[PDB]
Design a protein around this motif. Structure first.
Motif, PDB file in Angstrom:
ATOM      1  N   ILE A 298       1.566  -1.368   0.051  1.00 15.79           N
ATOM      2  CA  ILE A 298       0.128  -0.175  -0.395  1.00 15.79           C
ATOM      3  C   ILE A 298       0.800   0.815   0.296  1.00 15.79           C
ATOM      4  O   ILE A 298       1.190   1.618   0.981  1.00 15.79           O
ATOM      5  CB  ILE A 298      -1.319  -0.267   1.135  1.00 15.79           C
ATOM      6  CG1 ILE A 298      -1.904  -0.651   1.402  1.00 15.79           C
ATOM      7  CG2 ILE A 298      -1.898   1.594   1.329  1.00 15.79           C
ATOM      8  CD1 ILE A 298      -2.097  -1.760  -0.069  1.00 15.79           C
TER       9      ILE A 298
ATOM     10  N   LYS B 169       0.962   5.163   0.646  1.00 16.82           N
ATOM     11  CA  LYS B 169      -0.133   6.474   0.317  1.00 16.82           C
ATOM     12  C   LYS B 169       0.686   7.263   0.105  1.00 16.82           C
ATOM     13  O   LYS B 169       1.764   7.973   0.369  1.00 16.82           O
ATOM     14  CB  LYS B 169      -0.539   6.337   2.508  1.00 16.82           C
ATOM     15  CG  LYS B 169      -1.242   8.077   2.663  1.00 16.82           C
ATOM     16  CD  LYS B 169      -0.725   7.753   4.184  1.00 16.82           C
ATOM     17  CE  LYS B 169      -2.302   8.501   4.166  1.00 16.82           C
ATOM     18  NZ  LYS B 169      -2.338   8.226   5.529  1.00 16.82           N
TER      19      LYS B 169
ATOM     20  N   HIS C 293      -4.192   5.853  -2.071  1.00 12.87           N
ATOM     21  CA  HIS C 293      -2.982   4.559  -1.701  1.00 12.87           C
ATOM     22  C   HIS C 293      -2.876   4.339  -3.030  1.00 12.87           C
ATOM     23  O   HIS C 293      -3.469   3.098  -3.118  1.00 12.87           O
ATOM     24  CB  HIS C 293      -4.017   4.534  -0.548  1.00 12.87           C
ATOM     25  CG  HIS C 293      -3.846   5.167   0.689  1.00 12.87           C
ATOM     26  ND1 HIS C 293      -4.717   6.432   0.531  1.00 12.87           N
ATOM     27  CD2 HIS C 293      -4.015   4.822   1.727  1.00 12.87           C
ATOM     28  CE1 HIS C 293      -4.784   7.534   2.033  1.00 12.87           C
ATOM     29  NE2 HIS C 293      -3.436   5.517   2.821  1.00 12.87           N
TER      30      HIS C 293
ATOM     31  N   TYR D 237      -5.516  -0.761   6.084  1.00 15.81           N
ATOM     32  CA  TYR D 237      -6.085  -0.374   5.165  1.00 15.81           C
ATOM     33  C   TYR D 237      -6.811  -1.306   4.899  1.00 15.81           C
ATOM     34  O   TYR D 237      -7.602  -0.862   4.056  1.00 15.81           O
ATOM     35  CB  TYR D 237      -4.631   0.538   4.637  1.00 15.81           C
ATOM     36  CG  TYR D 237      -5.276   1.024   2.987  1.00 15.81           C
ATOM     37  CD1 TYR D 237      -5.190   0.323   2.256  1.00 15.81           C
ATOM     38  CD2 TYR D 237      -5.771   2.609   3.666  1.00 15.81           C
ATOM     39  CE1 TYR D 237      -6.397   0.327   0.948  1.00 15.81           C
ATOM     40  CE2 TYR D 237      -6.573   2.610   1.710  1.00 15.81           C
ATOM     41  CZ  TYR D 237      -6.388   2.310   0.860  1.00 15.81           C
ATOM     42  OH  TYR D 237      -6.518   2.601  -0.486  1.00 15.81           O
TER      43      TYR D 237
END
Length: 125
Positions: free
Chosen positions: A20, A22, A58, A96
């Motif tokens: 992931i 961000k 993201h 997330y």
């Protein structure tokens, strides 16, 4: 079910966290099309999840090294527009993702024409 390993600070499920990434800006954020084209221009990415109508996106990568390389190279981004890049890790990354997985389950509802009858479905049964 062979034991992975004794007591040595381990983890849980090995759910490919598609790394992931961000991304946060202050305005320059052109959009998913531009943000995706950007990060993707520096290094081919898998999928970019930008909060439509938001300044926080993201992007998920297929490899960890790709995310590290992009974030390191992103420093240059400021050369044109101040941009922030941070790689989710630990509970933060898993958290997330948890949201992602949940979204996948909800996706059960797909558009188009399917089945015949009234508006009612129960896990198909």
């Amino acid at each position: 079910m062979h034991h992975h390993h004794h007591h040595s600070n381990a983890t849980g499920p090995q759910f490919v966290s598609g790394v992931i990434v961000k991304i946060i800006s202050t305005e320059p954020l052109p959009g998913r099309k531009q943000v995706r084209d950007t990060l993707a221009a520096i290094s081919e990415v898998l999928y970019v999840d930008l909060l439509e109508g938001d300044t926080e996106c993201h992007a998920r990568f297929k490899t960890p090294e790709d995310a590290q390389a992009v974030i390191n190279a992103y420093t240059e981004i400021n050369k044109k527009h101040c941009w922030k890049l941070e790689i989710l890790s630990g509970d933060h990354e898993q958290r997330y993702w948890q949201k992602i997985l949940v979204d996948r389950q909800a996706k059960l509802n797909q558009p188009r024409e399917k089945k015949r009858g009234t508006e009612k479905l129960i896990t198909k049964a």
